[PDB]
């Protein structure tokens, strides 16, 4: 069972993956986010956020309004299954979540909630396999 993934968000507003697989034998799954490049948090800060496909737009919109000092997420947002903090270059963060939080049939999306980043396609799918 492969129960973690290392993902990078760079100074050019991209993740180095578009698709995450979660082994369904995993009890927990861990995302390790890092930020190659030179740009600080306030310029090109990234996070990793998990929601259902349907909820992503809302999470992003409300997170935009919540703003930078809230790490671009509505605090305690019920739609956020898991999330890292916002990180700048040189910084890192991990998040671990229960795999039981994912449903059969459902469609899940990961993304950066930082202003404009998801629109520029800092997103992809997350799928139970």
User: Could you tell me whether strands 82-83 and 49-52 are parallel, antiparallel, or unpaired per DSSP bridges?
Assistant: antiparallel
Cα separation, 37 vs 18, in Å, equals: 19
Q: Which of 45, 16, 48, 17 is nearest to 33 (CA)?
A: 48
The size of the interface with Cu ion (CB under 5 A), counted in residues, is 5
Cα distance between residue 103 and residue 44, in whole Å? 32
Interface with Cu ion includes 95 (CB under 5 A)? no
Tally of CB atoms within 10 A around 64: 18
Residue 117 makes contact with Cu ion by CB under 5 A:
yes
Q: How far is the CB of 24 from Cu ion (least distance, A)?
A: 28
Is position 22 an interface residue for Cu ion (rule: CB under 5 A)?
A: no
Question: Nearest distance from residue 1's CB to Cu ion, in Å?
Answer: 29
Binding-site positions for Cu cation? 46, 122
Region of residue 13 (phi > 0: left; psi between -120 and 50: alpha; otherwise: beta): left
Footprint of Cu ion on residues 27-46 (CB under 5 A)? 46
Residue 114 lies near Cu ion (rule: CB under 5 A): yes
Range in contact with Cu ion (rule: CB under 5 A) among 33-41, 54-62, 84-92, 109-117: 109-117
List residues binding Cu ion (CB under 5 A).
Answer: 46, 112, 114, 117, 122
């Amino acid at each position: 069972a492969e129960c973690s993934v290392d993902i990078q968000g760079n100074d050019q507003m991209q993740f180095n993956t578009n698709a995450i697989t979660v082994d369904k034998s995993c009890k927990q799954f861990t995302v390790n986010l890092s930020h190659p490049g030179n740009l600080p948090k306030n310029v090109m800060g990234h996070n990793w956020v998990l929601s259902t496909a349907a909820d992503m737009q809302g999470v992003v919109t409300d997170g935009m309004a919540s703003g930078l000092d809230k790490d671009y997420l509505k605090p305690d947002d019920s739609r956020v299954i898991a999330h890292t903090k916002l990180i700048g270059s040189g910084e890192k963060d991990s998040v671990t979540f229960d795999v039981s939080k994912l449903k059969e049939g459902e469609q899940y999306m990961f993304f950066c909630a930082a202003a404009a980043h998801a629109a520029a396609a800092m997103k992809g799918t997350l799928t139970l396999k």
